[model samples]
Every structure is written in structure tokens, then in C-alpha cells.
Target chain A: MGISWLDIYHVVSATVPLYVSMTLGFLSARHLKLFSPEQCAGINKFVAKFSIPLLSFQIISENNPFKMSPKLILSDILQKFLVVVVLAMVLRFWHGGKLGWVITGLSISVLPNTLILGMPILSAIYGDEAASILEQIVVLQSLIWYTILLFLFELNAARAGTMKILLKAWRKLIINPNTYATLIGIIWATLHFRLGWNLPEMIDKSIHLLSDGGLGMAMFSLGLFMASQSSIIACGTKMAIITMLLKFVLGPALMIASAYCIRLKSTLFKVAILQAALPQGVVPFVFAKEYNLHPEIISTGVIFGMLIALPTTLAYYFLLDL
Target chain B: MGISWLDIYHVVSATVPLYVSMTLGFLSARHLKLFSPEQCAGINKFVAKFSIPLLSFQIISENNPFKMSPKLILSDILQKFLVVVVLAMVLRFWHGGKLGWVITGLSISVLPNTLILGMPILSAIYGDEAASILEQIVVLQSLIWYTILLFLFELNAARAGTMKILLKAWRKLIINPNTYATLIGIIWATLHFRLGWNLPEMIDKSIHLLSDGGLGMAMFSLGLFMASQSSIIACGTKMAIITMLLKFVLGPALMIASAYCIRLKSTLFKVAILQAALPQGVVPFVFAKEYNLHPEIISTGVIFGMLIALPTTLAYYFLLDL
Candidate 1:
């Protein structure tokens, strides 16, 4: 199917609101002085600790884990593996790269805004089947990838003896709300799929009420993050250039190679590569900020990535369609 | 129709999540130590300045203003007028009542949480027609009543010269985003009704992204409000009792009288009286908090009102049905 005006509209609809939400938060904090620095930090903390975890639980529990495609799963795994290998090479061979850069690099290049931008745009382009494929990716991103991301952050944060550091990281991971949310969601999904269990309507609605605001709040918090910053481009010119290349260029390149290795179907192949090229996820930026990592780079990546995501994805769409 | 298990399920689904969301906020702020006082206030400010206004715009613009029944509209207006007249007499005769009490009394007794609790519960009880009726009232509540509420708050906040006070109050009203949202929504609705105009899908989606979080965030902020308080029953025993009586008892009494005055239809009459009996609106609580008025009373009304709303409305349902 060819891209239509309707497809363009859908893509814009999905992406534009993110910017608007960010702008609203930015203006409120920056121009209006409605939020102080502590208040901004508090908003971000609420999203990370409360809304996002509930969001993770809601999304994971609702999806049918058994329905995911084998080929797509392999390709996703392969893409992440390739990124780690490449990052390892950079850290080993390149003297300038720090341990923290590996985490920052991985965040910018690997994590995609699949939930907010990818689902709507790809579903618009490729219809319901594409959405199902994206859902599987989203499930993995939240369940497996995010947990690993947190573990890495913990590892980076920990100090001293090897066994002590490992134990400390493990303890931190166990305490994380996202970890628990993912586990509970999987448990509920298993019960739902095999036993036909359902949440009491009251409990379901209660979780959903907060979970519903998850993505919107993430984006809004990003705006607050932006406003709190003295500059929109928190990372300097050279690093900004490097982040763009890694996210837009290196990300899709790895996905393209991985998809081919798995012999993925043409449509599914296009979906994987394009989604890889989708902007930096807002969640990752929050994680980076929480860990006292390179939040500046991650925040810059999210803002600029989202601005360029539309044209970039369209380019990949037309090229891959052929 | 008699209440079914399904209706009970739907009602619980609508109301329980609110408590859960509120509890989530309360625990996060109270026991969890996740949010500071300034942060809590920031969250509330964002809700008031951003999400609610967008919510007001989205709801008012989307509704077909022409379809509302004159009788239903008159009944709602009459109910408010009756509350004001009674409050006026109380202030004049009682000598104990302050000017601020009139504002607090009007807020508790007149404004209902029609958008959140009223729509779902009444629609479940009476079906789609009931939702349509509720939609009309929501439009009026947002467009007319809320603006009036803000004006009164500004009036109370203003001091000095009568003309200067009125001018300052009017200026505040004009600058209030809710006022603009309502005016723009009405303008858009008028164009939409007469000329078949529509918001560009991009613009609509952008607006909706934030608006979708309005009710949820408001509820969450109320939870934050509860946590910020030294006590859940902030207004104390006697005042809490009086607030409940006004919200639950006197409010419905006024609606019953007004519905009869307007000769509302049987189904429409039940809808009117029942909605009037819905719990105190959260937005009004936010307004009360912002104005530095009797927020303690309003917050207590909201917390306790929600706890008691289901049984209260159901009692009215059975009685009104008879």
C-alpha cells in the first residue's frame, strides 16, 4: 500500500501532540515560573516511581505473550546484541569513551519511542498486523530490555569489590518498582492466557486510571526537563552530532543487518528497521536523569530525535517500500 | 431499570479507580516520601493551569451544543440559583457566616463531579441517553459554571476600590486559561455545528493527548492534596458533617425541586437529581486550594464524599426510581 494523506495525518497526529505536551510543560516552567527546580524533579520522580511502573504493569499484563513472532523476536534480540558488541569495541579501542558513555550510547541508540510514536505511525502505515508486531517489540522493551537497562545503570552506579558490587546491584534491581511491575504483569498475563482469569473491574479501572496518564506524563515531564535546562541542546555540538548518528544511523543499520540475518518477511523487515530509527524514548531519559548519568545528552537526543523522526522515518519508509 | 450486577460492576469500575489513584498519590507523598510539599503543589499547579483547561476545551468543543434540552438546562441553572439564594439568606441571617463561607458553601453544594463519576455511573444505570444528557450538563458545567466560579474566587481575592476590584477581577477572569478554552471551544463548536468544520487531526490529537490526563491527574493531585494535609478529615468532625449534608442531602433536594419546576421528563428528571447528588468535583477542590479558601472543607468533602458517593447515589437511585 502506498502512503496516503490519511497516513501522513495519522503520523502527525501521533507525533505532534508529544511536542505540544512538551511545549506546555516547558512554557509553564520556563516562562510562567509555575514550577521550580525541586518541583520539576518531583514531577519526574512521580512519573518514574509511580506512573511508569503502573504503565509497565498495565501494558505487559494486557498483551498475549504467547502470540509474539519468532523471527521478529530474534531480530530484536540480534539488534541489541549487535549494539552491545559495537559499544564494547568503542569502549575498548577508543580511548576517549568512558564507561558512562556506553550506557548513554546504548540508551540513545537502542531504546526507541515505540509505544508513543512507533505504534501509531507503523500501524497507520502497515495496518493492524504491524501493530501486533510492534506490540511484541513493546512487550520485550518493557519486560526484558528495561530491566537490563536498570541493571546496567545500577552496575555503573555501584562501587568497590566485585562480589559486593554485584550483590549491591542485584539488591537495587530487586527493590526497583519496574522490576516488580514487569514480573507481576507476566504472572497476570500467564493466568489470563491459560486460566481465563480477569482483574476485578474495579481493580482494573484503578490501575488504568493512573496507567492511562503514563505516556502523556512522560512527555510532559520531558518538557519540564527541557524547561529546567538552561539550553535545549544540553550536549555540545560534537556530542550532539555523535548522538544523532548513533540513534538515526547506527540504530537502523544494526536492525537492517539483524532483520536480514533472521530472514524476516519484507513487511516485518521494514517495520523493524524503521522502528529502530524512531526517536529516543522519554523513559530512558528519565532513567538517565535518575541515575545522575548523562541526562543532558539523553534529553537532547529525545528533543531533537522527535523533531527529526517524522522525515527520517518517511525516508526509510519510501526506500524500504521499494 | 433495576440495578444489575453489571451496573454494580460498572459503577465500581468508575469509582474504585478514583480511590485507588488517590491512595496511590497519598501513599507516594505520605509514606513513600516520594514528593515534597513544593513538588506536590507543582503537580497541582500543572493540573489547574494545563490539563484541566485543555479538558474543558476538548469536552466543550466536541459536544453538539444544539442538542441540549432547554428544560434540562433550566433545571441545572435553577438548582444553582436556589443554592445561591439559600446561602445568601444564611449569611444575612446567621451572622456567624463569613463572605468566604458563601463561596465555600456554594462550591460544596452546587458543583458536582459530573464529568468523572456522573457520566459513567449514570450511563451505566440509564445507558447512552443518560450519557447524552450528562454531556449537555458537562458542557454547561465547564463553559458557564466553572467560569463563574473563577470570577467569584477573583472577587474574593481582590481588595480596595469597588471599580478597581471589579476591574482586577475581570482582568484575572480574562487571563484565566479556562475562560479562553471555553470561549474557543464554543466558537469551534458553533463553526462545527453550522459549517461542518473540524479540527485538523494533528491539532485535535495534540489537544486530546493532554486532555486525556485531565481527570486522572486531577484525582492524583487530590491524593497529593490529601497527603499534604496533616489529617484526612481536614475540616474536623462538625464541619465535615455539615459539608456532607450540603453535598449529599441539600444538593439533591434543590435538584428535585428544580426538576419539578422545569417539568423535566421522567428519565431526564432522574438524571438531573442523580447528577446533582454526585460527589464534589475535583476541579472545584483544586480551585478551592488555589484561592486559599476553605480547601480543608472541600478536600474533606471530596475524600469523604467519594467514599460515600456510591451508596448515596444508589440510595437516591432506588428512591428516585420508585
Candidate 2:
């Protein structure tokens, strides 16, 4: 697709600040030793265990996903599930993939950087009205897919019997803060209760502060993670290129189809589909590293997936307008 | 000194939430062991370093301290100076106080929990307009007093000559992040700037998130710090009672006297004196702990000083209003 100035403007303006934050994390770690690579893991611990949970709660509580379009939410879940199902089957049957590799492939193939990059960039491109839609998509992604992904990855990683892995996966899912927070948020929303009604201002402020830092630190942590890697341009296995193609090419194709099937339209439809099409996220790499899977491939997909996803999104934008 | 509903309401409303946060830290540390005593140090490190620095930058950048009442700032500096001078003399001459003890005495006598308690409570009581006054006072206190206090504390701790202690003090003063951040914020304001105008929206949001968490975690950290102590009710050092009396009684007296001498009046004078009279701050205790000097006295002073400070502030509030 030919680039329009508006498209270029939107992508570049939205992109530079993120890369700048990344650069800060990168430069500081390398030169000043402001933060060592050893510290990055601890920093990421806060991002996952503390900051992300709070962020998930904030997004879900604020948006009230239960009240969001049921059909739209359905479409998103369907699209994500379909991509995983198709990708997993193909990798397993056609490529002789193991369950771990299949989970890793599924992750790199669809999960967008919705919190760090997607929400802000989409809000910039499509206006702040897109925020509600993005929040809906983000909650739906984590609520439905996060647990499933964790369940799969854990099941794959465990050396024990089927029952042991299943039990562990169940425990992990139950103990998941994001899931717990979202459920509580939904219940709170359903009760028509705002956080301030029962909670003190100080507690609310604290959660908010953590939630705000969640995205920045998450991105910054990504940069730190990137810095610790010796090279960004290191060639990935053939599987990495295939996963990138699946993510940028097939992910959007399936999402648009799902959007059509669910009869989704307008900015909601556009936003949902666009998010589906956006970059292979850092979260996948995080999970891959945690689960001891193909982290290199996932990281490669994330870096190059983002590079390709922007043009892919612009193409979809131009075509959607047509 | 008589109990009024306003006093009761003020104390209960303001104090309960703070204690609740402290209790959360206390319980979490004791039972859940979510954070160990060892972790409390690092928690306070962020509270001191990242959160407080961002809080200072946010408060100063937003309010632009140059536009605040100069008399208030002067009164704060002057009050801090007088407390140090008078206390240093009493401790050194009358009671054979060492340099470390003198600095600790001055610290407990005057420093209020400006960032954690003062900013939130004062903003609640005096309206949001008081934030500017509080911010200005904070910057001035850091700029003028942080170094002096550190100098004396370090010199007493280190077996060093005058020149060596002087050099160490200079290094400590220069390296303080709160001082640096405030200075940068002031310069930014002087250049006719604001954080939002030129900075990327994403980057601004990230800073704001950290800034927001600053207060809540601070109060929570107070609880954590409290829990690490064997007992808040443990017997105080002889110096503790002296420091407490100075913090609650004479600190305000001297501040009011300074106000009178300088002809500082109105809200500016009231805020400055109240700030002077507010509880012995967390920062002093942090330093005391760091220097391995008079921590028991400082902690005792902080706990009871807070208990007494409520009534002290109410008395001042009523008289100021009158």
C-alpha cells in the first residue's frame, strides 16, 4: 500500500516516543550503569506481579467490560481462539511441533502490545474515543486468553504426569492476579459501585500510580530486556519468519473475518481488528522466557513483527477506508 | 486543647486511612510475608528515590514554586535554621550532645512528613491551593537544610577531620535527587515551560503514574517501617522526649515567632507554621537509620509526634482561623 502523509504522521508520531523511552532504558543500562541487567529482572518482576495486576484492574474497572458490546467481545475471543487453534494444529501436524513450541508460536502469532503500544498509539491515531474499545479488547485478551496461554505453557513446561500438570495449571489460573482483578472489577461494575465509594482516596491513588507506571516500565523493561540481548539483528530460525508472517498476515485476516461474522462495524470494529493486527507483543517474549520456551524466536518476532505490523496496519487502514 | 467535633472528625478521617495503609504493610509483613524486613529498606529506597523525586518534580512543575509566597518559603528555611541553632546549643552545651545527636535532635524537632502526610492532608484541609505553598517549602527545606543535616550527621559518624567531612557533605548535597529534580523543575518553569506541552503524552503519563503512587506507598512504607520496629511503644531515649516536645511544642512556637519577626502573615504564615509543627517526618528517620545514629529516638519521636501532631495542628488551625 502507498503511504499517505496522515498515515505516516500518525505512525511516526505515535512511534517515536516509545522508541525514545526504549532508548533511555537501553542507553542507561549500557553506559551509566544506572540500571544493571541483573536489576532488569527485578524491575520486570514489579511490572508483572505488581504493576500489571494493578493496570489490569484499572483498565477493567474503568471500562466495565461486562457493559461493553457483548458481540464485539465475542468477536475478539473468537478471533484469538481461532488463531491459536489453527496455528497450534498446523504447527503440530504439519511442522511436527511440540506443545511448548506450539504455545510459543500461538503467542507470537497474535498477542498485540495492547497496553504498552496499542492503546496509546490507537488513541493517537483514532482519537481518545478509541480508548474504551481498546480497553475492552485488552481485558478480553487477558481474561480469556491469558489464563489459557498460561495453562498451556505451564502444562507444557511441567515434567510431571498429566494430572499434576493439569492441577498446577488450575492452581496457576486460580492464583492469577489479572484474572482475579478482572473478575472483581466486573463484579464491582455489575454492583454499580465505583472504587471511591468504599475505598479511601489514598488507596485509589496508590493503585492508579502503579497502573500508570505499568505501561511505561513495561516498555522500558522491554528496552532493558533488549539491551541485555547481545544483538537485535541476530537471525532467527526459519520458524521465526513463518511466525512473523502468521502474525502480520494471518492474524489480521482472521480478525477481519471474525469481525464480519460477528457483524462488528464502525470504530469498534476497526479498533478491534487493528489491535489484532498490531505488533507481536513483548508479553509473549516475557512468557516465553519465563516458561523456558523459544524466547529468541519470540523476541525476534516482536522486534521485526512491530517493524512489519505498522505497514500492514496502514495498508489495512487504506483498504478499510476504501 | 479541648476536644471539638471538628478536631475529632479531622483526626479520625485523616488519620484512619493512613493507619489503615500502615496496618496493611504491618499485616503483610507479619503474616503474608509478602515483603520481608529486608525488602522494607528497598521499598523505602523507591519511596525516597523514585516516588519522592517524581512527587517533588510533579508538585513543583505543576505549581511553579517561584509563584508561591516567598515569605512562606523564608519562614520554613528560617524556622528550620532556628530549630537547628537552638537545639544544637541546648544539646551541645546543656546536655553534652554530640554532633550526630544535635543533627538528629534538629531533625526530629522540625521536619514534617511533608511529602507523604503533609501534601495529602494539607491539600485536604487547606484546599488544593496549599500544594504550591507546601511544594515551595519542600524545595527550600531540601536545598538549605538537607546538606547541613547530612553534614553534621556524617561528620559525627565518620572519624574524619573538618575538610573531609565538608567534602563528604558537599558530595551528599550534590547527589540528592529531590534537590536535583526540584532545581530542574524550577528551571523548566523559569523557561516558561510545562511538562505536558513539549513532552510526549505517553512519557508524561508514565511520570504521572509514578508520581501518583508516591503518596500511597509512602504511607504504606511508613507502616512497613513501623512493623520492622519491635514496638512503637518501646521506651524512648531521653532525647526522644526532648525531641518530641521540641517537634510538637517549640517547633511551632519558633515558627510563629519567625513569622512574626519576618511579618509573614495569612495562609502563607499559617501553612508554614503548621508544616513546621507537623509530625517528625519519615525522611529524618530514614537518615537516622542510614547513619546508624539515634534511630530509636527518631522513630519514637515520629510515632508519638504524629499522635500529638493532630491536636497540635488542630489548635493551630483554630487559632489561625480565629
Candidate 3:
């Protein structure tokens, strides 16, 4: 199916709610003073610690691990590898580059907002099969990449090359709720797929209820964070421009090359590239805030990226359709 | 259709999630110390101010205001009126009763958890028609009863017989976000029903998104509130017993008498009575917390009412079905 105005409408419909929620949070915290700074931090902590881990568990556990497309999975892996190698090289050679920026760069470019924005937009564009492929990517993003991102954050936080600090970072990573969530989710999915063992109805509903709050709460938390900031543009203009280029431009460019290298088919390739071009993920931004890393850049990327994503993704849609 | 195990299963499925969310909040706040007391208060404030109002707007706006059964509406009004008259009499004569207790009693008895638990359970038992009837009740609960509840709360907060304080309470009620949400929602519903108008897709999704978080967040906020308390049973043994009697026993009895006096039809009468037997409403508990009224009693009612709502509703279901 080719792109239509309806697709654009659907995309706008999907993203506007995030904006509405964020604006409510922003207005409540900043203007209304309903949510104090401590409350904002509490909300963010709630999201990062509880909602997101449960969300990741719910999503990952729902997917059929047995039926994934190997080539598409391979291409996704290759793309991330490419980004890591590139970022590592830049950090080594470039005098101006820092470990923090390297982490931020990887986050912006690789970790797309696949769950919320990408799921709706790509599904609208490419239909169920594309959604299915994107689901695999989502599973991987949660299970593997996000854990690694947390590791990098932990590593950065440790700021030590000594064996003791590295071990401590490892300990933190192992204990991280997200890590446990992913592992348990994978185990559940495997049991579910292989043995057809479903969670009891009460347990399933309980998990689902909290999981439902994940994206909306994440967006609301972002708004709370935004309200605490002096302006919506937390990252300065130059960094904002750089973040967008890395997120929208370089991310998809890497996905295309990866797809070409792995010979990913039409729908899978298109979905992969388009999802990569999605705005920086809300979860990663939560992580950035949690780690006291460069959340400003990621926050900027998310705000501006969401604002411009429709046009940018639509542009990519038309080009790919051609 | 006869009551079946599947219907009971569906009811459990619907409610378990609320408990799960609340439990998560409880653990995070109390055990894990993830959310501080100020944070818990903040989360509850967010729910009361933003999520609940938006939820009211979305739910009220979605219903067809014109198609409501006048008899059912009348019976609901009569039931609420009966509660108020009885409560007023008790306050007038009973030396032990307080304004706060009367408010708490009215809230427990009249404001059933119609939105979350009632919708699912009643719909399962009575099918789409029952759901339709319940939707009208939900609209009334939000549009009229909740406004009155806020007024009472404001009046209580003012604690003054002077016209100045009364006027101030009135002013506070007027500015309450729930009042605005209900008004705007009713206006939108009127337009929608009469002229076939709808919210713009973007705006609808935005509202819907925040609205989706309403019940879940309310439950979570309750959990946070629960955590801050010394024990799960905040209202002690006597009050808890009183709450259950008011919520499950007396409320339904009043509804039955009201239905009989009004000469309601079988299905409508059954639904009216059964829904009255449903749990104490969550939103009222949030209001109780917000106004610094007897949140403990309402909270006890909600927590225990949910635990026992199933068997209680089923008993009413079988009796009404007969």
C-alpha cells in the first residue's frame, strides 16, 4: 500500500496524545505548581523502576520467540554493531568527543521510539507483517540493547578502569530491574511458546494493567521533567540540530546499509529503516535521566523529533515507495 | 442469558489488574522506598487533577446523551436522594455522627466503582444493553454527583455558615477541573449526538491517551496512599464493617426499593440494584484524599470492597435474575 493523507492523519493522531500528556505534566509542574520537583523525580523514578520494566516484560513475553525473521534480526544486529563501532572510533580519535556524548549518540541514533510511535506509524504504513517485524525489533531493543545501554550508563557512572569498579558496574547491571524483567520475560515467552503455558488470568491482567500505563506515564514523566527545566528546549540549539541529524538521518542510513548487507526483504527492510528514523525513545530518555547523563540532548531529540517525525517519516515513506 | 463461570472469570480478569497496579505502587512506595511520602501525594494530586478530569471528559463525551432511559435515570436520582435524606436525618439526630462520616457514607453507598468494575461485570452479566445503561449512570455520576461531592468537600473545607464561605465553596466548585471536564464533555456529547460531530482525530487521541491512564493511575495512586499508611486496614475494624454494609448491603437495598417504587422493568431494575451492590468508587476515594477528609474510611471501602465485590455482585445477580 502506498502512502496516503490518512496515514499522515493516523501518525498525527498517535503522537498528539503523547504531546497532550506531556503538556499536562509540564503545565501542572511548571505553571500550576501542582507537582513539585520532588514529585516529578518520584514520577520519573516510578516510570523508570516499575512501569518500564513491567512494560518490557509484558511486550517481550507476548512475542513468539520461535517465529522471528532471522535476516531481519541479523540486519538489526548489524546496524547496532555499526553504530557502536562508529561511536567508539569517534570517541577514540576525536579530541572533543566524550564517553557521555558517545553514549548519548548511541541512544539517539539507535534506540528508536519503536514501542509507541513506531508501532502505530509503521503498522499504518506497512500493515500487520511490518508490525510483526517491528515487534521482533522491539523485543530485541528491550531485552538486549536496553540492557546494554544500562550497562554503558553503569560503566560511565563507575568512571573506573579498575577491576573492582568494573565488577561493581556489573553487579549494578545484574541487579537492574530492567535486566531481570527482560530475562524473566524471555523465559516466560519461551515457556509460553514451547509449552503453551499462559499466565493465570488474574496474574496476566495484573501485569497488563500496569503495562498499559507504561507509555502514557513515560510521556507524562517527560512532561514533568520538561516542566522542571527552564525551557522546553533543554539541549541547546546546536546540540538539538546534531541530535536530530544523528537520530533521523544517520540511524536510518545505517539501517539501510545493514538491510542491504543482510538482504532483508522489502517490507522488513522498509519497516526497519523507518523505525530507526523514529524519534529518540522515551525509555532511553528515562534511562538518561536516571543515570544523570545527557538527558537534555535526548529530551531535545524527543521533543523536536516528535514535532518533525510525521513529515520526516512521510518523506521516507514516499521515497521508499518510489 | 444465565450467569455462567465465564462471566465471573471475566469480572475477575477485569479487576485483578487494578489490584496489581495498586500492589505495585504499594510495594514501590512502602517496601522499596522508591516513592517518598511527598512523591505519593504528588502522584495522587496528578491523578485527581489531570487524569480523572480528562477521563471524565473522554467517557462522558463518548456516550450518547439523548438515548438514556428516563426511568433508570430517575431511579438512580431517587436512590441517591434516599441516601442523602437518611444521612441528613442521622446527622440531625445522632450525636456520634459527623459531617465527614456522612460524606464518607454517602460516597461509599452511592458512588459505586461503576466505571472500572461495574462496566465489565454488568456488561458481562447483562450484555450491551446493560453496558449502555451503566454508561448513562457513569455520565450522571461524573456530571452531577461528582460536582455535588466536590461542593460538599469545599463546603466542609470552608467550615463556615457565612455566605462568604458558602460563596467561596461555590467558587471553588466552579473552578474544579472535574466540573469543567464534565461540562465540556456533556456539551461535546450533545453536539455529537445531535449533529454527528466528533473530536478532531489528533485531539481525540490526545484526550483518549491521558484518559486511558485514569483508572490504572487511580489504582496506583491508591497503592501509594496505602503504602504511606501504617497498615492496609487504615479504617480499623468497626469502620471497615460499616463501609462494607453501606457499600454492599444498604445501597442495593435502597436501589431495589427505588426501582420498585418507580416500577422499573426487569433488566433495568436488576442492573440498578446490582450496580449499587458494586464496590465503592475509586474517584471518590481520590477526592476524599484530596480534600483531606476521611480518606481512610473510603480507602478501606475501596480496598475491601474490591476484594469482596465479586461474590456480593454475583449474589445480587442470581437474586435479580430470579
Candidate 4:
């Protein structure tokens, strides 16, 4: 109930990066007049093909897959999924886009920046308890949903050879490391096993060493990514707004309604809302951009959303507190 | 001490994938004669540019970078880093290769499989507690040592424009989501007020979710990955021998020695040894194949090492009653 340090941390860090990264990148780009989406095409390629894969792979590999009780977590997942679907529906309906397409885009784009930006700030704002809750919600989303949806999104967008299409769908979901790490982690935990940390917890200390790269620089990449995509962002203007709004605002609001309507009392609702309200995670856009989506458009939409939505995140938190 | 269901389940799952994949890859290569040293060249790109960065990024970004006591972990790291240096030196002294060049080849080649293989296997073998410990160590190794080695490796072997080299490194490490997740997590966890799991914890799970692709299929993919690397197995020659000894024998023997010297009371030695003892992870080879760094050589080395190490792993478990 009391104000937590993590809360303060989140409020400050969430918005500050925009000014720091965006301004620096904009100035750099402007000064050099280095304006070309092509300049950053390789960014998406590297991010999608390798970076995201590694990010997903390393986590999934460590976590045991079988031990998880999706049932226990399902109620919580349903909380977020329902909210995303319905809100997406409404947003798409409002825009007169195809209902399925809108829903798909909303679901795909509403990924939470839980690990990237959320937990660290949250840990600073709250404490380990809140961090634990955040962690579970993240695991639930990744293992339970991402596997099914990765295909739905990947296949739907691309024209695949018919025989290979089904194979690719399954491949995209299974071959990727992200879902696997969760499955492995949950299964191991469920089975009461551990992995690398058991022998030397001090080694766990090494996890801290990974952060030197920082967000401001990474976000600048996002800026570069968006800089390249001016044309695309301009191209899909309406759909972009709908996607962002669904992710940032409407998604959370609907989750609230779903939680209340479903009479779910567990913390899944809160977790759902937090994930629902995330600034669009560009990591996925890295994938989406590559297999032939608008990387630049996604970059612009996400970066734009992050800048505007920082206060919205705070407002949601404050409003939720009330 | 009775065979826990967790143990049984893991035995049923991860082993087959690990065993079958590598052997199959070796067999396939032999059958088709696709194996060659030329493919190894590609790995230079895969690892130095993309794979290592992504792996480092994912592991670093999701976990708390600072939770582990630096002194304790650092000392151990220093030991291992030296071991690597010494091993390379010894190999070079015995052979006629340059110390640095041979060390680079051996370190990258004979190194740990932190994410893809090490994590899930340790989780299964040791339980969550042990698996988590292993995860920490692997991530630490990745963050602490991987980038430097990889950077140096690239610098020596490949030529790039100055701006491009730095840019490449930046993209490989800084912009990478995997690295940032752990970095942020660790930083948040380090301060006095941030204790236990909290919002940072939440972000950890979400990032983990993004990082974890799928459970069952991912493991199968490992199996498939093992199968795919069959070419490397057939042609590894002396390289395979060195990798096997380093990964399964020497790396583990060193870990056991360290644990005893440290005088830990728990099952630390068993965990560390198993973590170190596993065969070459597909990760390094994935890098090799992606970038054209003798992917064939590395893959063969890994696949053969994995195949041969199976009995060793099983024997160790049985011998230790682990």
C-alpha cells in the first residue's frame, strides 16, 4: 500500500529515455541528413534473425518445459488475452478494418516490455514480491500464449508454400528459443529442479553484469529503425494508431472489465493490465519487420507510443491505486 | 534419493533430444557428404557478429545483474578465465599454433553452452534450484567473458570498416534485448531498497517469456538441431576431441576442484560438474553456421561431442546418484 521505490523508478525511467534517445538520434540523423529506411534494414535483420532468437532461445532452454500447470495460470492468461482480443476488436471495428486482422494486429503488437523496461523499474519501484508477480505473468504469457500465436501472426502475414506453410508455422513457434525457455524453466521449477544457479549462487551474480548496454542506446536504435520507416509509418497511419491505442489504453481498460466480469480474484488481472499497458515491444517488431512487415512503421509506432504513453502508464498506476 | 518424478520426466525428454539430434546430424552429413571445412568460415560471422551478442544480450537482460556478490563470482570467473587462457596456451605449446589464435579457436569452440543446452539440461539434471544456479553461471560467463572474446576474435579474424566494426559490436551487444534485460534486472536488484522479487521480477518473467520460444518443440528443435549438425560430427577430427575434453572432462574437473576448494556444503559440485560436462551447445555452432565460420567443423564437433558425452553424462548421474 505504501509508495514503493520501484514505483518511483518506473515513473522516472519510463519517460526519460524518449527525450534522451529520441532527441539525440533525431539530431544525429538530421545533422547528417542521414534519412533512409534502408540505412536500418539490416538492424531488423540482425535483431529479428539473431537477437530475438537468442533472447528467446537462451531463456526457453534453461527452463524445464513440462512441469508447468497451465491450468493454474490459465485463468490469469485468459484475463489478458480476453482483454486484448475485445479491445482489439473494438479498436478495429472503430477503424472499419477487418475484425480478425485488427484483433490479430492488436494481439501481436500488445506485447509487454516487462523484462526489458518493466521489471527493473518495478524492482526499483516496488520490491521482490512485486517482481515475482511480474515474473509469473511474463512466464504465463510466453509459455501459454506465444507458442500458439507466433504462428498465427507469422503465417497470416506471409505467403507460404502450402506444404511448407504448416511446417513453417510449427517451426516458428517451436524452433524459436523464447517459448522453449519458459517451458523448460516452468517444468524444472514445477518439478522442483534448478539449473545453472544451484551450484554457485554467486554465478547468479553474473546476471547483473549484462546490463551495461543500457536502454537509451537501444532506443536510439529504435529511433534509427523508425527513421528508416517514415514512409511506412506514414503509409499505415490509421492502423498504426489503432494498434497503439489498443496496446496502451483500451487493452488495459478492457482487461479491467474482463477481470470484473469474469469474477477473477487472482492477481492475473493486475499482471494482465501491466502487460496489456506496455509500450509496444520493438523486439517482436524486429521479427515482424523481417519476415516482411513494416519494421520502420512498427518502430515509429512503438517509439511514438512509448513517448506519449509514459504518463498514461503512471496515470493507470495511480488510477489503479485509487 | 529415490528417483523423483522430476528426474524421470527430464530423462524422458531432454536426453533424447540431446542425444538423437547430434548423432543424426553426424549421420546425415556422412550420408550426403555435405560436411566440409569451408563451412566453418561462416561461423566467424555468426558468432562474432550476431549469435554471441544475442545470447549475451538475452541472458544479461532478463536477470538481475547485481544480485550475485561480485567478489565471490569474480574470483571464480578469474579462475575460469585463466583456465581458458592456460588451456589455450597449453594447446598452443603442444601444437605450433599461436597462443592467441589457438586460444580463440578453443575458447569459442570448447566453451559453454549456456542457453540452449546448458540451461534445460541442468534444470532437468539438478532440479530448479540447481538449474537456476547453472543459469546464473552461464549468463555470467556470457556477460563477463563472451563479448570480449568475441570482439577480439572478430578483430583478429575479420576486417570491417572502423565505424562498421564499432557499429557491429554495438548492435551485437548494446541494442540487443537479451543483454539489456539482465543488465536492467541486476541494476534494479542491486540497491538496498530493492529486495527479493518485485517489479524487476515481473519484467524478468516477461522478458523471459519473450525469450522462451516454446517448450516441447524447442527441445525437439534441439534434437533437430543436433540432427542438423551431423555433418560436423563426421568431420570434427582433432577439433572434436579437444571440444569433448574441454566441455565434458576438463571444464567439469575444474569446476569440481573449485567447489571442493571453496568448501561448499550443498550439491554444488554435482551441479557445476554437470553444467560444465554437457556437450557443445548448438548456440556457438548456430553462430558459426549463420556466419560461415566452419559451421561444419563446429557443428560436427558439437554433434559428435554431444553423442559421445551422453554415456558420460548418464554415467556421472548414476555414479553420483544425482
Chain B TM-score of candidate number 3: 0.96
Per-model TM values vs. the true structure: 0.93, 0.82, 0.92, 0.46
Q: Encode model 2's per-residue lDDT on A112-190: one tens digit a residue.
A: 8786567656776677878778777777776667667877876776643468778887777677666687677666555
Better of 3 and 4 by DockQ: 3
Which scores greater on DockQ, model 1 or model 3?
A: 1
The better candidate by TM-score, 2 or 4, is: 2
Give residue A60's lDDT in candidate 3 (0 to 100): 91
Pairs that clash in candidate 2: none
Scored by CA lDDT, what does every candidate get?
Answer: 0.85, 0.67, 0.84, 0.51
Sorting all predicted structures by TM-score, with the top scorer first, yields 1, 3, 2, 4
lDDT of 4 by residue, B81-148 (tens): 65667676676557522634443355543366555555555666667777667667776766655555
For model 1, the DockQ equals 0.65
In model 3, where do residues sit more than 4 Å from their true spots? A1-3, A95-97, A123-128, A263-269, A314-322, B1-4, B95-97, B123-129, B314-322
What are the clash counts of all predictions, listed in order?
0, 0, 0, 112
Per-residue error (Å), model 3, residue B45: 1.2
DockQ of 3: 0.57
- Candidate 1, superposed: residue stretches over 4 Å from native: A1-6, A95-97, A124-128, A260-266, A314-322, B1-5, B95-97, B124-129, B318-322
Compute the lDDT of residue A171 as modeled in candidate 1.
98
Sort the candidates on lDDT, descending order.
1, 3, 2, 4
Place model 1 in a CAPRI quality band: medium
Q: Which CAPRI tier for candidate 2?
A: incorrect
Candidate 3 lDDT tens digits, B1-322: 4557788788888888888888878887788778888888878887898788888888789898888888988999999999888878877876332777778878999999898889889887778878778888888888889888898899888873489889999998887898899899999999999999867877876776666667778888888888877777897998789788887888888899899989997688788888899888789989998888888888878988999998888888778767
